[PDB]
């Protein structure tokens, strides 16, 4: 997270950390708990090649990485069939937990938007994670969960900015319709925030608008961050997750 504060100790009860085996269970990707047995995440964190589930764990909300861990095992990984790379689209995935989670005052599920929501500019949206704090700077050894409020852009205004300073012909669509744009040179997601939720407060309720997907570096001029647009994939999500 570039810019932004440390997160209060009760503000995003749905944030998930993904861990990979090694000398220690290292954090590498984010997610959100959307059902007591399902985690929503980015496809490029886990595919396109198949992974051994022995190497993966989920950790639920905690203020500081590693300090008090309770690693949950994963039963199944589901990646959208149309994913190969992030820039092409369908960067979305599901993890099914072995054991269901007790909903508690510390851990609660985020709500998915209705298919009609568009998230026009001016809405209040945040992104949260444990990723790098600047373009080459790791998060320091205490490892707090950070948060930042980002602006939203319309897709066509975002696509136009990506053509500035590029050889790409401006007939060639870069930002597809299953995507969403947010952030600016002072405020962005960064490496290791991938797969994390983007949430907006609509009519008093927090809805997950997007998933951190890709971008041309962190906080660079005319390069907003790209998010997978959750409303585009609701029918695919509800084929596995019990609504």
């Amino acid at each position, epitope marked *: 997270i570039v810019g932004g504060q440390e997160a209060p100790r009760s503000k995003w009860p749905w944030q998930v950390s993904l*861990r990979v*085996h090694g000398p220690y*269970w290292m954090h590498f990707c984010g997610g959100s708990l959307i059902h007591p047995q399902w985690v929503l995440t980015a496809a490029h964190c886990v595919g396109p090649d198949v992974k051994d*589930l*022995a190497a993966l*764990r989920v950790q639920l909300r905690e203020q500081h990485l590693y300090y008090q*861990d*309770q*690693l*949950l*095992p*994963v*039963s*199944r990984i589901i990646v959208h069939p149309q994913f190969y790379t992030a820039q092409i689209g369908a960067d979305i995935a599901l993890l099914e937990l*072995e*054991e269901p989670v007790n909903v508690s005052s510390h851990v609660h599920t985020v709500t998915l938007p209705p298919a009609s929501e568009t998230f026009p500019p001016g809405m209040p949206c945040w992104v949260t994670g444990w990723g790098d704090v600047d373009n080459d700077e790791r998060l320091p050894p205490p490892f707090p969960l950070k948060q930042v409020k980002v602006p939203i852009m319309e897709n066509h205004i975002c696509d136009a900015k990506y053509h500035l300073g590029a050889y790409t012909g401006d007939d060639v669509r870069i930002v597809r319709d299953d995507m969403l744009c947010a952030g600016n040179t002072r405020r962005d997601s960064c490496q290791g925030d991938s797969g994390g939720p983007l949430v907006c407060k609509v009519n008093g309720t927090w809805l997950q608008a997007g998933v951190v997907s890709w971008g041309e570096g962190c906080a660079q001029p005319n390069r907003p961050g790209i998010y997978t647009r959750v409303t585009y994939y609701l029918d695919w999500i509800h084929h596995y997750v019990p609504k």
Partner: antibody
Amino acid sequence: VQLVESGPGCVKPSETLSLTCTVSRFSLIGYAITWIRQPPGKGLEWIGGISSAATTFYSSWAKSRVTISVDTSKNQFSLKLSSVTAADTAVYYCARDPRGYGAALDRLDLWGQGTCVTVSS
Amino acid sequence: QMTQSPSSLSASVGDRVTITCQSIKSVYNNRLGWYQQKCGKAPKLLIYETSILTSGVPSRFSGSGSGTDFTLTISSLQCEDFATYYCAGGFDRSGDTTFGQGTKVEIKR
């Protein structure tokens, strides 16, 4: 990188059997342990286990009498069986599931050398 | 609950053998494994998830199956293949999981 059981070897009836299993390097964080029993001449039967999430699972009969626990301060897993009887005479093993599942038997990759327990007067 | 067959078999060095395991229900999602136990030792995992060979196991062993019926097969008997063999599998999460009765393999020489 290996497990070791420990136990009394000989016990009388109506005591409680205690067993421990210790991991010799690397921590246990992230891993499940299951307890397997082998009566003389029989095959293998499953007692129970504990997941990486610290959830405990027990087979049908064990639920009445068994407790499984973990103590990170000692790098140990422990099995306790109440009210032992002669039919409990078996070799006991601890084994690891690398996925951290608390109740699965298809991928027990790492085993202790076993400990034999005799119930007799 | 499961059955494993045959309960014993006796074959020549060099030869091929097969072992079958069957169930009333179907394994949850490819959750079936094969173990080798030699006299006086703990079981060793050979095959997991129906068909993945464990590292360092010689490619003499192979396994396949279809949710309800599964087979373990050797390409060629060596002397140290003397052992008992067990299937194991799980039919849900958190519940019904069990071993098979085991099979005893004799070398003839």
